[PDB]
């Protein structure tokens, strides 16, 4: 029941498009997709699109997981923001490029009291015009729960490896 898109279809959605928030997570680290991610960010930025990175406190599997890999890939600190700093901006962003994150975006954290993820603060990616998930399959994250964002109109599911997809997304630009 999911709108399953491809590298080509996902690419031009972000081309124009005025504002893009990159939301990286554990799958970005697993794939080592961070050099290819900053490449894409530079392709967006040079055309004139606003690019920023939204980092959840527990993105990845360790404190500062996304920070070290983005620092390796030379993304500058002035474009990287913490949850409480960046959560308002999703309303103004056209796309929420979710690369290997899932639990970090899941609105059951504030909706469903029965879930294990309930009461953890999350990034409000749903408030963006479109939500691009990159993720290999329909499997769960760390918490083991479904994301209701996967199968709602404004979302697009990109079934692939995060480095491979992002490299393939960079082709069409």
């Amino acid at each position: 029941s999911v709108k399953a898109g491809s590298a080509e279809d996902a690419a031009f959605i972000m081309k124009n498009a005025s504002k893009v928030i990159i939301v990286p997570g554990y799958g970005m680290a697993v794939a080592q997709a961070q050099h290819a991610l900053r490449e894409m960010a530079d392709v967006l930025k040079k055309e004139g699109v606003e690019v920023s990175y939204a980092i959840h406190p527990v993105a990845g599997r360790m404190p500062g997981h996304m920070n070290v890999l983005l620092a390796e890939a030379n993304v500058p600190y002035d474009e990287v923001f913490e949850l409480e700093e960046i959560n308002s901006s999703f309303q103004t962003a056209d796309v929420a490029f979710v690369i290997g994150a899932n639990d970090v975006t899941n609105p059951a954290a504030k909706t469903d009291p029965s879930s294990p993820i309930y009461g953890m603060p999350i990034l409000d990616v749903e408030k963006a015009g479109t939500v691009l998930f990159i993720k290999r399959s329909m499997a769960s994250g760390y918490a083991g729960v479904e994301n209701e964002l996967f199968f709602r109109n404004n979302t697009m599911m990109l079934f692939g490896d995060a480095k491979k997809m992002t490299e393939q997304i960079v082709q069409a630009m």
Partner: protein, 364 residues
């Protein structure tokens, strides 16, 4: 209310359970925030910084704690059996929140119970998504992993990164991380970003992918049977290793021996071992608490209280864990603290309350 934060009096403890950021938040909750003078000096937090944030500076620990309804500190209070009766300074009926070490230290729990103090042991925080922000084990272990690499690099007589120069090339350092939990993962990240070749090993299966997600390589190509079997593919890499970092704990029990004396004989001279598990017996038998010992040409480093070697970053994070745990229970109106008993974070962490030991593991 009347929340107080004293200086840490235990030897080598430079952390404090407050920051200026958290002081501002506490007065916003409706607290008079009191803190002992000199408490944040080891954490590079001056008395003026706390005063500017809204805190009152008390001259002694007794004055700081006399009227306090809530007490925050990092390590457990000392008892009269240790020479300094710190629990006596705490007001009767008050709330204590700290790293108590409650399941290994029953005497402090007994002593707090005598004065009807309600004690919340922060190390027993339940492992749920909601309480990750309240988790002192993670916040303090993380910095200890970073430190391990800084200590290793300081003791090592070669540089971490590869350097191709006019006068020749010097190779990168080779790092082996035993145990890839919170500390081990940050040690992998810090070693790798400094230019070292980083290997790692762990008993748990999901760790292999975590090691690889930081650009490390996991050691495996192809009761007490962990120890005997593991060290064969590990020994191959350990012989090439410059800095070995051991971070493995078994909760409650002593630490597993991951490098024997036999194994350190087969290491090259000028190598260093950082044993972060030294307070629980060490992953290396040669390690000694608070000492750097040299044997077989190898430095075995066994610093105590590694988070306190990063006290100035450790203390703000600890104070935030305390604030994130505290904040949901302040009734905003009528200046009160009502710790909800349905709450898993309250029930899992509470050790004694109103003059009676509460925790299942500690009850008679």
């Amino acid at each position: 209310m009347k929340i107080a934060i004293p200086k840490e009096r235990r030897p080598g403890e430079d952390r404090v359970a407050i920051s200026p950021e958290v002081v501002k938040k506490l007065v916003g909750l409706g607290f008079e925030v009191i803190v002992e003078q000199g408490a944040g000096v080891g954490a590079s937090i001056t008395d003026d910084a706390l005063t500017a944030a809204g805190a009152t500076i008390a001259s002694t620990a007794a004055q700081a704690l006399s009227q306090a309804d809530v007490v925050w500190k990092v390590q457990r209070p000392m008892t009269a059996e240790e020479g300094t009766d710190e629990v006596a300074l705490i007001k009767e009926g008050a709330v204590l929140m700290c790293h108590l070490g409650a399941l290994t230290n029953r005497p402090v729990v007994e002593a707090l119970t005598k004065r009807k103090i309600t004690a919340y042991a922060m190390e027993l925080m339940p492992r749920i998504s909601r309480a990750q922000s309240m988790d002192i084990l993670s916040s303090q272990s993380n910095l200890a992993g970073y430190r391990a690499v800084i200590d290793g690099a300081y003791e090592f007589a070669r540089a971490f990164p590869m350097m191709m120069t006019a006068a020749g090339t010097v190779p990168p350092a080779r790092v082996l991380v035993f145990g890839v939990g919170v500390a081990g993962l940050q040690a992998i990240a810090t070693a790798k970003r400094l230019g070292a070749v980083v290997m790692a090993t762990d008993v748990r299966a999901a760790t292999k992918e975590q090691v690889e997600s930081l650009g490390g390589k996991f050691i495996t190509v192809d009761g007490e049977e962990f120890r005997k079997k593991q060290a064969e593919a590990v020994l191959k890499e350990l012989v090439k290793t410059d800095i070995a970092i051991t971070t493995a704990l078994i909760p409650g029990k002593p630490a597993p021996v991951l490098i024997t004396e036999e194994m350190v004989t087969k290491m090259k001279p000028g190598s260093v071992i950082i044993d972060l598990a030294v307070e629980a017996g060490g992953n290396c038998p040669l390690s000694e608490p608070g000492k750097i010992v040299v044997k077989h040409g190898v430095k075995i480093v066994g610093h105590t209280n590694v988070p306190s070697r990063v006290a100035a970053d450790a203390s703000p994070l600890f104070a935030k864990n305390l604030l994130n745990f505290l904040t949901p229970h302040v009734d905003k109106d009528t200046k009160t603290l009502v710790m909800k008993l349905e709450d898993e974070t309250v029930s899992g962490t509470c050790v004694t309350r109103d003059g009676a030991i509460v925790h299942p593991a500690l009850t008679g």
